[PDB]
Amino acid sequence: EVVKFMDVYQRSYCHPIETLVDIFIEYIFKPSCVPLMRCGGCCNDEGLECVPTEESNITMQIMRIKPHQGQHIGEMSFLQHNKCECRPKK
Amino acid sequence: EVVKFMDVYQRSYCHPIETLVDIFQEYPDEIEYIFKPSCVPLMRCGGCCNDEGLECVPTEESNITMQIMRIKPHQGQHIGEMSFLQHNKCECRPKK
Amino acid sequence: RGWVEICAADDYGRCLTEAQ
Amino acid sequence: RGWVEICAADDYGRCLTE
């Protein structure tokens, strides 16, 4: 039926949100995209933007496939946004 | 803690995911107004497919109603209901 | 698309009350 | 970048040795 103002306001405010980010002729990676925390959402006025303020890395198993020839599990390290702030644009 | 392949794969496959969408994308002709918040959380198709000849697109859509504040600079503000597009179902379909 | 008025509101998004 | 091999795997991502 209707999402209430307080809830729209809180859920939309600048924070880390799960984002499916593509990893990038010989190999295919699977999956080709990973789920990572990325700063998003909005701030109280158009002069402010949501930016990352604390970042860290997360390791995930990714399969590397050489089609019709082989397929190996490997680890890859990706960037995470742990914390975000609204700051003046420029 | 290393995320195991099975979890990375299930979590990133094509599906509707909460996306923070600016309101001007859905309401572009509203330059006389400031909306607050200026963006809203919506389910939109995201994620990847198993083949590069497929693409993650919506296969069922509907609208969702949210209470938004609409500000007229120097002339007060009102709360109202606005309606936004959301994706209910998504599939990996041939690019064609 | 579309707007359905609910109320005139304060700066916090809470509806204003009538004076009388 | 920096993909580090762990093992040859099956279709489910399990090492073939598993």
Side-chain angles (χ1 to χ4, degrees):
Chain A
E1 176 111 46
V2 188
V3 183
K4 307 313 187 269
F5 179 77
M6 178 176 153
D7 291 327
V8 194
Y9 178 98
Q10 288 197 272
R11 293 168 53 207
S12 74
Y13 196 90
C14 181
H15 70 287
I17 187 147
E18 179 164 277
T19 304
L20 300 191
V21 184
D22 290 336
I23 299 162
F24 315 96
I25 4 157
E26 182 158 53
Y27 299 110
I28 289 167
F29 291 77
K30 184 185 181 162
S32 62
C33 74
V34 286
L36 301 175
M37 283 316 202
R38 288 286 187 267
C39 285
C42 37
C43 292
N44 293 148
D45 64 71
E46 288 279 350
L48 302 177
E49 53 181 9
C50 183
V51 293
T53 61
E54 269 210 70
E55 296 177 349
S56 59
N57 296 269
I58 183 177
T59 305
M60 299 188 167
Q61 294 186 327
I62 300 298
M63 187 142 79
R64 188 178 69 182
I65 291 161
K66 196 180 198 323
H68 322 307
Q69 298 195 265
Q71 62 195 13
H72 287 245
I73 277 294
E75 290 180 355
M76 279 184 76
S77 187
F78 297 100
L79 177 76
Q80 297 278 50
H81 293 174
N82 301 330
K83 265 178 205 329
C84 308
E85 274 192 321
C86 288
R87 282 182 185 167
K89 300 159 165 183
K90 228 256 160 43
Chain B
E1 30 122 74
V2 175
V3 185
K4 283 213 146 55
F5 166 80
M6 193 211 180
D7 301 312
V8 187
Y9 179 79
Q10 293 295 331
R11 289 175 57 205
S12 73
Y13 194 84
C14 181
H15 66 291
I17 191 175
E18 188 158 271
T19 304
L20 295 166
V21 183
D22 296 325
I23 293 180
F24 79 86
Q25 302 269 339
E26 317 274 297
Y27 285 81
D29 56 326
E30 304 282 356
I31 290 83
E32 301 181 357
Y33 288 113
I34 299 87
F35 290 107
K36 193 175 198 194
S38 59
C39 73
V40 291
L42 303 175
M43 295 299 194
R44 293 298 175 80
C45 295
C48 37
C49 293
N50 286 339
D51 141 28
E52 211 56 31
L54 304 171
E55 52 168 8
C56 183
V57 295
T59 55
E60 184 79 80
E61 288 183 353
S62 66
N63 297 311
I64 186 173
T65 304
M66 294 189 192
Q67 294 179 341
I68 303 299
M69 173 176 342
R70 184 173 81 168
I71 306 173
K72 231 302 213 38
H74 305 305
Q75 289 301 302
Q77 59 264 322
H78 288 246
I79 296 286
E81 283 179 5
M82 285 170 68
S83 174
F84 297 96
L85 173 67
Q86 59 176 5
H87 298 162
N88 297 89
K89 288 193 187 305
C90 307
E91 196 191 349
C92 285
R93 301 301 210 80
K95 296 192 177 171
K96 204 181 149 278
Chain C
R1 283 196 72 92
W3 170 263
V4 174
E5 170 68 10
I6 293 167
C7 69
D10 63 26
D11 281 348
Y12 311 112
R14 311 178 275 206
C15 293
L16 294 177
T17 64
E18 291 303 327
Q20 306 183 269
Chain D
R1 78 163 142 286
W3 177 92
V4 173
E5 204 268 353
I6 298 301
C7 66
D10 66 15
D11 280 359
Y12 299 108
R14 311 177 289 182
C15 299
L16 290 181
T17 51
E18 203 182 358

PDB file of all heavy atoms in Angstrom, chain A residues 8-42:
ATOM      1  N   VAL A   8      10.870   5.936   4.249  1.00  0.00           N
ATOM      2  CA  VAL A   8      11.538   6.314   2.986  1.00  0.00           C
ATOM      3  C   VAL A   8      12.791   7.174   3.271  1.00  0.00           C
ATOM      4  O   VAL A   8      13.904   6.967   2.783  1.00  0.00           O
ATOM      5  CB  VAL A   8      10.662   7.157   2.059  1.00  0.00           C
ATOM      6  CG1 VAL A   8      11.297   7.198   0.651  1.00  0.00           C
ATOM      7  CG2 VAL A   8       9.255   6.594   1.962  1.00  0.00           C
ATOM      8  N   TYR A   9      12.637   8.086   4.218  1.00  0.00           N
ATOM      9  CA  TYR A   9      13.700   9.008   4.598  1.00  0.00           C
ATOM     10  C   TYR A   9      14.891   8.252   5.169  1.00  0.00           C
ATOM     11  O   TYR A   9      16.044   8.495   4.781  1.00  0.00           O
ATOM     12  CB  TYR A   9      13.097  10.053   5.536  1.00  0.00           C
ATOM     13  CG  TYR A   9      14.076  11.067   6.081  1.00  0.00           C
ATOM     14  CD1 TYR A   9      14.205  12.318   5.492  1.00  0.00           C
ATOM     15  CD2 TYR A   9      14.873  10.794   7.200  1.00  0.00           C
ATOM     16  CE1 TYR A   9      15.099  13.262   5.995  1.00  0.00           C
ATOM     17  CE2 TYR A   9      15.754  11.727   7.694  1.00  0.00           C
ATOM     18  CZ  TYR A   9      15.875  12.959   7.094  1.00  0.00           C
ATOM     19  OH  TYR A   9      16.750  13.916   7.584  1.00  0.00           O
ATOM     20  N   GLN A  10      14.671   7.331   6.111  1.00  0.00           N
ATOM     21  CA  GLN A  10      15.752   6.574   6.710  1.00  0.00           C
ATOM     22  C   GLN A  10      16.415   5.588   5.759  1.00  0.00           C
ATOM     23  O   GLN A  10      17.647   5.533   5.645  1.00  0.00           O
ATOM     24  CB  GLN A  10      15.230   5.815   7.947  1.00  0.00           C
ATOM     25  CG  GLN A  10      14.969   6.816   9.098  1.00  0.00           C
ATOM     26  CD  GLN A  10      14.866   5.996  10.396  1.00  0.00           C
ATOM     27  OE1 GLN A  10      13.758   5.563  10.689  1.00  0.00           O
ATOM     28  NE2 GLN A  10      15.958   5.797  11.107  1.00  0.00           N
ATOM     29  N   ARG A  11      15.602   4.836   5.011  1.00  0.00           N
ATOM     30  CA  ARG A  11      16.180   3.852   4.089  1.00  0.00           C
ATOM     31  C   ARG A  11      16.908   4.457   2.903  1.00  0.00           C
ATOM     32  O   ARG A  11      17.797   3.763   2.354  1.00  0.00           O
ATOM     33  CB  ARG A  11      15.051   2.917   3.581  1.00  0.00           C
ATOM     34  CG  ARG A  11      14.479   2.023   4.688  1.00  0.00           C
ATOM     35  CD  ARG A  11      13.185   1.309   4.279  1.00  0.00           C
ATOM     36  NE  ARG A  11      13.349   0.580   3.021  1.00  0.00           N
ATOM     37  CZ  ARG A  11      12.410   0.277   2.140  1.00  0.00           C
ATOM     38  NH1 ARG A  11      11.127   0.614   2.272  1.00  0.00           N
ATOM     39  NH2 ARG A  11      12.786  -0.387   1.051  1.00  0.00           N
ATOM     40  N   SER A  12      16.586   5.690   2.528  1.00  0.00           N
ATOM     41  CA  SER A  12      17.227   6.285   1.337  1.00  0.00           C
ATOM     42  C   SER A  12      18.500   7.040   1.617  1.00  0.00           C
ATOM     43  O   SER A  12      19.343   7.232   0.730  1.00  0.00           O
ATOM     44  CB  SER A  12      16.203   7.220   0.661  1.00  0.00           C
ATOM     45  OG  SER A  12      16.118   8.398   1.487  1.00  0.00           O
ATOM     46  N   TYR A  13      18.697   7.385   2.894  1.00  0.00           N
ATOM     47  CA  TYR A  13      19.869   8.159   3.315  1.00  0.00           C
ATOM     48  C   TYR A  13      21.159   7.411   3.064  1.00  0.00           C
ATOM     49  O   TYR A  13      21.309   6.254   3.491  1.00  0.00           O
ATOM     50  CB  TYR A  13      19.747   8.552   4.809  1.00  0.00           C
ATOM     51  CG  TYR A  13      20.740   9.659   5.156  1.00  0.00           C
ATOM     52  CD1 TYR A  13      20.359  11.001   5.027  1.00  0.00           C
ATOM     53  CD2 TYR A  13      22.011   9.337   5.592  1.00  0.00           C
ATOM     54  CE1 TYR A  13      21.282  11.989   5.328  1.00  0.00           C
ATOM     55  CE2 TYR A  13      22.945  10.341   5.884  1.00  0.00           C
ATOM     56  CZ  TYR A  13      22.541  11.652   5.753  1.00  0.00           C
ATOM     57  OH  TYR A  13      23.415  12.668   6.054  1.00  0.00           O
ATOM     58  N   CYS A  14      22.136   8.123   2.541  1.00  0.00           N
ATOM     59  CA  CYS A  14      23.514   7.722   2.293  1.00  0.00           C
ATOM     60  C   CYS A  14      23.972   6.615   3.222  1.00  0.00           C
ATOM     61  O   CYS A  14      24.196   6.846   4.436  1.00  0.00           O
ATOM     62  CB  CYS A  14      24.436   8.947   2.571  1.00  0.00           C
ATOM     63  SG  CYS A  14      26.202   8.740   2.325  1.00  0.00           S
ATOM     64  N   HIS A  15      24.286   5.441   2.669  1.00  0.00           N
ATOM     65  CA  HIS A  15      24.847   4.354   3.497  1.00  0.00           C
ATOM     66  C   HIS A  15      25.374   3.286   2.548  1.00  0.00           C
ATOM     67  O   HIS A  15      25.099   3.359   1.361  1.00  0.00           O
ATOM     68  CB  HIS A  15      23.745   3.793   4.423  1.00  0.00           C
ATOM     69  CG  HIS A  15      22.701   3.014   3.669  1.00  0.00           C
ATOM     70  ND1 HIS A  15      21.766   3.629   2.863  1.00  0.00           N
ATOM     71  CD2 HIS A  15      22.447   1.690   3.569  1.00  0.00           C
ATOM     72  CE1 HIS A  15      20.982   2.734   2.300  1.00  0.00           C
ATOM     73  NE2 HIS A  15      21.369   1.555   2.727  1.00  0.00           N
ATOM     74  N   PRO A  16      26.064   2.290   3.081  1.00  0.00           N
ATOM     75  CA  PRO A  16      26.594   1.199   2.267  1.00  0.00           C
ATOM     76  C   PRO A  16      25.469   0.282   1.798  1.00  0.00           C
ATOM     77  O   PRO A  16      24.694  -0.219   2.620  1.00  0.00           O
ATOM     78  CB  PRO A  16      27.524   0.433   3.183  1.00  0.00           C
ATOM     79  CG  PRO A  16      27.828   1.410   4.291  1.00  0.00           C
ATOM     80  CD  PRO A  16      26.537   2.176   4.484  1.00  0.00           C
ATOM     81  N   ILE A  17      25.372   0.131   0.479  1.00  0.00           N
ATOM     82  CA  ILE A  17      24.282  -0.785   0.045  1.00  0.00           C
ATOM     83  C   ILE A  17      24.809  -1.854  -0.911  1.00  0.00           C
ATOM     84  O   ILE A  17      25.726  -1.603  -1.689  1.00  0.00           O
ATOM     85  CB  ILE A  17      23.097   0.029  -0.464  1.00  0.00           C
ATOM     86  CG1 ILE A  17      21.911  -0.902  -0.751  1.00  0.00           C
ATOM     87  CG2 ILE A  17      23.569   0.828  -1.665  1.00  0.00           C
ATOM     88  CD1 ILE A  17      20.517  -0.345  -0.521  1.00  0.00           C
ATOM     89  N   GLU A  18      24.233  -3.066  -0.780  1.00  0.00           N
ATOM     90  CA  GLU A  18      24.754  -4.169  -1.613  1.00  0.00           C
ATOM     91  C   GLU A  18      24.476  -3.873  -3.079  1.00  0.00           C
ATOM     92  O   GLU A  18      23.371  -3.487  -3.454  1.00  0.00           O
ATOM     93  CB  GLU A  18      24.096  -5.497  -1.204  1.00  0.00           C
ATOM     94  CG  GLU A  18      24.620  -6.644  -2.084  1.00  0.00           C
ATOM     95  CD  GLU A  18      24.285  -7.969  -1.430  1.00  0.00           C
ATOM     96  OE1 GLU A  18      25.076  -8.347  -0.547  1.00  0.00           O
ATOM     97  OE2 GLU A  18      23.258  -8.528  -1.841  1.00  0.00           O
ATOM     98  N   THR A  19      25.522  -3.968  -3.867  1.00  0.00           N
ATOM     99  CA  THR A  19      25.564  -3.568  -5.267  1.00  0.00           C
ATOM    100  C   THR A  19      26.228  -4.701  -6.032  1.00  0.00           C
ATOM    101  O   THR A  19      27.265  -5.161  -5.562  1.00  0.00           O
ATOM    102  CB  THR A  19      26.382  -2.271  -5.474  1.00  0.00           C
ATOM    103  OG1 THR A  19      25.805  -1.231  -4.636  1.00  0.00           O
ATOM    104  CG2 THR A  19      26.397  -1.780  -6.932  1.00  0.00           C
ATOM    105  N   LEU A  20      25.682  -5.105  -7.168  1.00  0.00           N
ATOM    106  CA  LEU A  20      26.240  -6.246  -7.899  1.00  0.00           C
ATOM    107  C   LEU A  20      27.215  -5.704  -8.915  1.00  0.00           C
ATOM    108  O   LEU A  20      26.762  -4.973  -9.786  1.00  0.00           O
ATOM    109  CB  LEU A  20      25.048  -7.047  -8.429  1.00  0.00           C
ATOM    110  CG  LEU A  20      24.098  -7.594  -7.351  1.00  0.00           C
ATOM    111  CD1 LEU A  20      23.085  -8.587  -7.913  1.00  0.00           C
ATOM    112  CD2 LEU A  20      24.819  -8.311  -6.208  1.00  0.00           C
ATOM    113  N   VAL A  21      28.531  -5.787  -8.719  1.00  0.00           N
ATOM    114  CA  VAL A  21      29.512  -5.079  -9.529  1.00  0.00           C
ATOM    115  C   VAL A  21      30.251  -6.000 -10.490  1.00  0.00           C
ATOM    116  O   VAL A  21      30.750  -7.026 -10.007  1.00  0.00           O
ATOM    117  CB  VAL A  21      30.577  -4.419  -8.619  1.00  0.00           C
ATOM    118  CG1 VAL A  21      31.579  -3.589  -9.422  1.00  0.00           C
ATOM    119  CG2 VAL A  21      29.877  -3.526  -7.574  1.00  0.00           C
ATOM    120  N   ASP A  22      30.246  -5.715 -11.793  1.00  0.00           N
ATOM    121  CA  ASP A  22      31.001  -6.598 -12.691  1.00  0.00           C
ATOM    122  C   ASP A  22      32.468  -6.690 -12.292  1.00  0.00           C
ATOM    123  O   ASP A  22      33.092  -5.668 -12.013  1.00  0.00           O
ATOM    124  CB  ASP A  22      30.924  -6.131 -14.147  1.00  0.00           C
ATOM    125  CG  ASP A  22      29.522  -6.330 -14.699  1.00  0.00           C
ATOM    126  OD1 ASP A  22      28.761  -7.186 -14.193  1.00  0.00           O
ATOM    127  OD2 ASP A  22      29.158  -5.641 -15.676  1.00  0.00           O
ATOM    128  N   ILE A  23      33.058  -7.900 -12.388  1.00  0.00           N
ATOM    129  CA  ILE A  23      34.468  -8.047 -12.013  1.00  0.00           C
ATOM    130  C   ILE A  23      35.317  -7.244 -12.994  1.00  0.00           C
ATOM    131  O   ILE A  23      36.237  -6.538 -12.551  1.00  0.00           O
ATOM    132  CB  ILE A  23      34.956  -9.490 -11.887  1.00  0.00           C
ATOM    133  CG1 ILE A  23      34.165 -10.243 -10.804  1.00  0.00           C
ATOM    134  CG2 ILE A  23      36.438  -9.545 -11.571  1.00  0.00           C
ATOM    135  CD1 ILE A  23      34.320 -11.766 -10.955  1.00  0.00           C
ATOM    136  N   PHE A  24      35.055  -7.354 -14.298  1.00  0.00           N
ATOM    137  CA  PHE A  24      35.781  -6.489 -15.245  1.00  0.00           C
ATOM    138  C   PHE A  24      34.780  -5.632 -16.029  1.00  0.00           C
ATOM    139  O   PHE A  24      34.928  -4.396 -15.957  1.00  0.00           O
ATOM    140  CB  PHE A  24      36.737  -7.237 -16.188  1.00  0.00           C
ATOM    141  CG  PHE A  24      37.527  -8.242 -15.387  1.00  0.00           C
ATOM    142  CD1 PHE A  24      37.100  -9.556 -15.332  1.00  0.00           C
ATOM    143  CD2 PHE A  24      38.634  -7.870 -14.654  1.00  0.00           C
ATOM    144  CE1 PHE A  24      37.787 -10.493 -14.583  1.00  0.00           C
ATOM    145  CE2 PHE A  24      39.326  -8.785 -13.898  1.00  0.00           C
ATOM    146  CZ  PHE A  24      38.905 -10.103 -13.863  1.00  0.00           C
ATOM    147  N   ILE A  25      39.978 -12.869 -23.782  1.00  0.00           N
ATOM    148  CA  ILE A  25      39.365 -13.709 -24.801  1.00  0.00           C
ATOM    149  C   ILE A  25      39.461 -15.197 -24.466  1.00  0.00           C
ATOM    150  O   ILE A  25      38.805 -16.036 -25.079  1.00  0.00           O
ATOM    151  CB  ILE A  25      39.982 -13.511 -26.199  1.00  0.00           C
ATOM    152  CG1 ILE A  25      41.172 -12.551 -26.193  1.00  0.00           C
ATOM    153  CG2 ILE A  25      38.907 -13.037 -27.172  1.00  0.00           C
ATOM    154  CD1 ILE A  25      42.121 -12.737 -27.368  1.00  0.00           C
ATOM    155  N   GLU A  26      40.339 -15.520 -23.540  1.00  0.00           N
ATOM    156  CA  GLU A  26      40.688 -16.868 -23.165  1.00  0.00           C
ATOM    157  C   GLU A  26      39.838 -17.477 -22.050  1.00  0.00           C
ATOM    158  O   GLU A  26      39.633 -18.696 -22.052  1.00  0.00           O
ATOM    159  CB  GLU A  26      42.158 -16.820 -22.696  1.00  0.00           C
ATOM    160  CG  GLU A  26      42.737 -18.163 -22.300  1.00  0.00           C
ATOM    161  CD  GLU A  26      44.252 -18.183 -22.360  1.00  0.00           C
ATOM    162  OE1 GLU A  26      44.902 -17.311 -21.756  1.00  0.00           O
ATOM    163  OE2 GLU A  26      44.805 -19.095 -23.020  1.00  0.00           O
ATOM    164  N   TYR A  27      39.526 -16.693 -21.024  1.00  0.00           N
ATOM    165  CA  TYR A  27      38.870 -17.196 -19.837  1.00  0.00           C
ATOM    166  C   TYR A  27      37.529 -16.491 -19.611  1.00  0.00           C
ATOM    167  O   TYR A  27      37.387 -15.318 -19.977  1.00  0.00           O
ATOM    168  CB  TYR A  27      39.623 -16.956 -18.517  1.00  0.00           C
ATOM    169  CG  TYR A  27      40.986 -17.585 -18.419  1.00  0.00           C
ATOM    170  CD1 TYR A  27      42.142 -16.813 -18.423  1.00  0.00           C
ATOM    171  CD2 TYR A  27      41.116 -18.963 -18.333  1.00  0.00           C
ATOM    172  CE1 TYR A  27      43.390 -17.407 -18.339  1.00  0.00           C
ATOM    173  CE2 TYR A  27      42.347 -19.563 -18.244  1.00  0.00           C
ATOM    174  CZ  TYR A  27      43.487 -18.779 -18.252  1.00  0.00           C
ATOM    175  OH  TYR A  27      44.710 -19.393 -18.167  1.00  0.00           O
ATOM    176  N   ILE A  28      36.667 -17.236 -18.882  1.00  0.00           N
ATOM    177  CA  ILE A  28      35.435 -16.601 -18.423  1.00  0.00           C
ATOM    178  C   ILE A  28      35.455 -16.676 -16.901  1.00  0.00           C
ATOM    179  O   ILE A  28      35.866 -17.693 -16.334  1.00  0.00           O
ATOM    180  CB  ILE A  28      34.235 -17.367 -19.012  1.00  0.00           C
ATOM    181  CG1 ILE A  28      34.153 -17.101 -20.522  1.00  0.00           C
ATOM    182  CG2 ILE A  28      32.940 -16.992 -18.322  1.00  0.00           C
ATOM    183  CD1 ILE A  28      33.226 -18.001 -21.297  1.00  0.00           C
ATOM    184  N   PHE A  29      35.116 -15.591 -16.200  1.00  0.00           N
ATOM    185  CA  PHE A  29      35.000 -15.681 -14.752  1.00  0.00           C
ATOM    186  C   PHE A  29      33.561 -16.010 -14.413  1.00  0.00           C
ATOM    187  O   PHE A  29      32.698 -15.327 -14.980  1.00  0.00           O
ATOM    188  CB  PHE A  29      35.528 -14.397 -14.090  1.00  0.00           C
ATOM    189  CG  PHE A  29      37.032 -14.409 -14.336  1.00  0.00           C
ATOM    190  CD1 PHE A  29      37.565 -14.063 -15.566  1.00  0.00           C
ATOM    191  CD2 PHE A  29      37.883 -14.812 -13.324  1.00  0.00           C
ATOM    192  CE1 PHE A  29      38.934 -14.097 -15.800  1.00  0.00           C
ATOM    193  CE2 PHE A  29      39.250 -14.832 -13.525  1.00  0.00           C
ATOM    194  CZ  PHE A  29      39.771 -14.485 -14.772  1.00  0.00           C
ATOM    195  N   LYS A  30      33.314 -16.844 -13.412  1.00  0.00           N
ATOM    196  CA  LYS A  30      31.953 -17.108 -12.933  1.00  0.00           C
ATOM    197  C   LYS A  30      31.870 -17.095 -11.426  1.00  0.00           C
ATOM    198  O   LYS A  30      32.646 -17.805 -10.745  1.00  0.00           O
ATOM    199  CB  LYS A  30      31.569 -18.550 -13.373  1.00  0.00           C
ATOM    200  CG  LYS A  30      30.138 -18.942 -13.017  1.00  0.00           C
ATOM    201  CD  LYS A  30      29.874 -20.405 -13.366  1.00  0.00           C
ATOM    202  CE  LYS A  30      28.438 -20.815 -13.039  1.00  0.00           C
ATOM    203  NZ  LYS A  30      28.071 -22.070 -13.764  1.00  0.00           N
ATOM    204  N   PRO A  31      30.963 -16.329 -10.829  1.00  0.00           N
ATOM    205  CA  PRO A  31      30.111 -15.394 -11.566  1.00  0.00           C
ATOM    206  C   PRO A  31      30.920 -14.276 -12.209  1.00  0.00           C
ATOM    207  O   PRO A  31      32.035 -13.996 -11.726  1.00  0.00           O
ATOM    208  CB  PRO A  31      29.175 -14.864 -10.494  1.00  0.00           C
ATOM    209  CG  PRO A  31      29.972 -14.921  -9.213  1.00  0.00           C
ATOM    210  CD  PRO A  31      30.802 -16.201  -9.363  1.00  0.00           C
ATOM    211  N   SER A  32      30.297 -13.462 -13.107  1.00  0.00           N
ATOM    212  CA  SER A  32      31.024 -12.378 -13.704  1.00  0.00           C
ATOM    213  C   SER A  32      30.820 -11.075 -12.925  1.00  0.00           C
ATOM    214  O   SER A  32      31.433 -10.049 -13.206  1.00  0.00           O
ATOM    215  CB  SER A  32      30.658 -12.199 -15.179  1.00  0.00           C
ATOM    216  OG  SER A  32      29.267 -11.870 -15.242  1.00  0.00           O
ATOM    217  N   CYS A  33      30.023 -11.149 -11.871  1.00  0.00           N
ATOM    218  CA  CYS A  33      29.790  -9.963 -11.060  1.00  0.00           C
ATOM    219  C   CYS A  33      29.681 -10.389  -9.613  1.00  0.00           C
ATOM    220  O   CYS A  33      29.464 -11.578  -9.400  1.00  0.00           O
ATOM    221  CB  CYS A  33      28.495  -9.226 -11.494  1.00  0.00           C
ATOM    222  SG  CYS A  33      26.990 -10.034 -11.014  1.00  0.00           S
ATOM    223  N   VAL A  34      30.002  -9.502  -8.670  1.00  0.00           N
ATOM    224  CA  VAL A  34      30.018  -9.907  -7.252  1.00  0.00           C
ATOM    225  C   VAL A  34      29.191  -8.936  -6.438  1.00  0.00           C
ATOM    226  O   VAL A  34      29.064  -7.767  -6.841  1.00  0.00           O
ATOM    227  CB  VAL A  34      31.483  -9.956  -6.756  1.00  0.00           C
ATOM    228  CG1 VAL A  34      32.140 -11.211  -7.351  1.00  0.00           C
ATOM    229  CG2 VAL A  34      32.225  -8.672  -7.083  1.00  0.00           C
ATOM    230  N   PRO A  35      28.680  -9.345  -5.284  1.00  0.00           N
ATOM    231  CA  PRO A  35      27.928  -8.512  -4.370  1.00  0.00           C
ATOM    232  C   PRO A  35      28.814  -7.791  -3.350  1.00  0.00           C
ATOM    233  O   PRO A  35      29.555  -8.409  -2.575  1.00  0.00           O
ATOM    234  CB  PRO A  35      27.019  -9.528  -3.655  1.00  0.00           C
ATOM    235  CG  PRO A  35      27.904 -10.737  -3.556  1.00  0.00           C
ATOM    236  CD  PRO A  35      28.704 -10.767  -4.825  1.00  0.00           C
ATOM    237  N   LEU A  36      28.892  -6.458  -3.485  1.00  0.00           N
ATOM    238  CA  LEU A  36      29.781  -5.629  -2.688  1.00  0.00           C
ATOM    239  C   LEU A  36      29.028  -4.433  -2.092  1.00  0.00           C
ATOM    240  O   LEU A  36      28.110  -3.932  -2.738  1.00  0.00           O
ATOM    241  CB  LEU A  36      30.900  -5.075  -3.593  1.00  0.00           C
ATOM    242  CG  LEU A  36      31.801  -6.080  -4.312  1.00  0.00           C
ATOM    243  CD1 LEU A  36      32.782  -5.400  -5.253  1.00  0.00           C
ATOM    244  CD2 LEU A  36      32.589  -6.957  -3.316  1.00  0.00           C
ATOM    245  N   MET A  37      29.445  -4.031  -0.901  1.00  0.00           N
ATOM    246  CA  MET A  37      28.886  -2.856  -0.222  1.00  0.00           C
ATOM    247  C   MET A  37      29.441  -1.609  -0.899  1.00  0.00           C
ATOM    248  O   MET A  37      30.680  -1.503  -1.068  1.00  0.00           O
ATOM    249  CB  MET A  37      29.353  -2.843   1.235  1.00  0.00           C
ATOM    250  CG  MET A  37      28.663  -3.795   2.173  1.00  0.00           C
ATOM    251  SD  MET A  37      26.857  -3.885   2.012  1.00  0.00           S
ATOM    252  CE  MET A  37      26.509  -4.521   3.668  1.00  0.00           C
ATOM    253  N   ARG A  38      28.568  -0.775  -1.462  1.00  0.00           N
ATOM    254  CA  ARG A  38      29.018   0.444  -2.126  1.00  0.00           C
ATOM    255  C   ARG A  38      28.174   1.619  -1.584  1.00  0.00           C
ATOM    256  O   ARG A  38      26.965   1.441  -1.400  1.00  0.00           O
ATOM    257  CB  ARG A  38      28.875   0.460  -3.648  1.00  0.00           C
ATOM    258  CG  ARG A  38      29.880  -0.463  -4.382  1.00  0.00           C
ATOM    259  CD  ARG A  38      31.262   0.125  -4.361  1.00  0.00           C
ATOM    260  NE  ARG A  38      32.331  -0.518  -5.136  1.00  0.00           N
ATOM    261  CZ  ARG A  38      33.082  -1.414  -4.495  1.00  0.00           C
ATOM    262  NH1 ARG A  38      32.758  -1.644  -3.221  1.00  0.00           N
ATOM    263  NH2 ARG A  38      34.080  -2.027  -5.122  1.00  0.00           N
ATOM    264  N   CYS A  39      28.843   2.749  -1.341  1.00  0.00           N
ATOM    265  CA  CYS A  39      28.039   3.872  -0.818  1.00  0.00           C
ATOM    266  C   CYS A  39      26.991   4.298  -1.833  1.00  0.00           C
ATOM    267  O   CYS A  39      27.250   4.438  -3.051  1.00  0.00           O
ATOM    268  CB  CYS A  39      28.992   5.054  -0.531  1.00  0.00           C
ATOM    269  SG  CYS A  39      29.963   4.781   0.958  1.00  0.00           S
ATOM    270  N   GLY A  40      25.757   4.495  -1.354  1.00  0.00           N
ATOM    271  CA  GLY A  40      24.706   5.020  -2.226  1.00  0.00           C
ATOM    272  C   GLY A  40      23.612   5.729  -1.418  1.00  0.00           C
ATOM    273  O   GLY A  40      23.572   5.688  -0.178  1.00  0.00           O
ATOM    274  N   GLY A  41      22.620   6.223  -2.165  1.00  0.00           N
ATOM    275  CA  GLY A  41      21.491   6.925  -1.523  1.00  0.00           C
ATOM    276  C   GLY A  41      21.842   8.422  -1.525  1.00  0.00           C
ATOM    277  O   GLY A  41      22.713   8.902  -2.263  1.00  0.00           O
ATOM    278  N   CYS A  42      21.074   9.173  -0.745  1.00  0.00           N
ATOM    279  CA  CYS A  42      21.065  10.618  -0.903  1.00  0.00           C
ATOM    280  C   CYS A  42      21.281  11.307   0.434  1.00  0.00           C
ATOM    281  O   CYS A  42      21.375  10.697   1.504  1.00  0.00           O
ATOM    282  CB  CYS A  42      19.733  11.067  -1.556  1.00  0.00           C
ATOM    283  SG  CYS A  42      18.252  10.180  -1.066  1.00  0.00           S
TER     284      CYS A  42
END
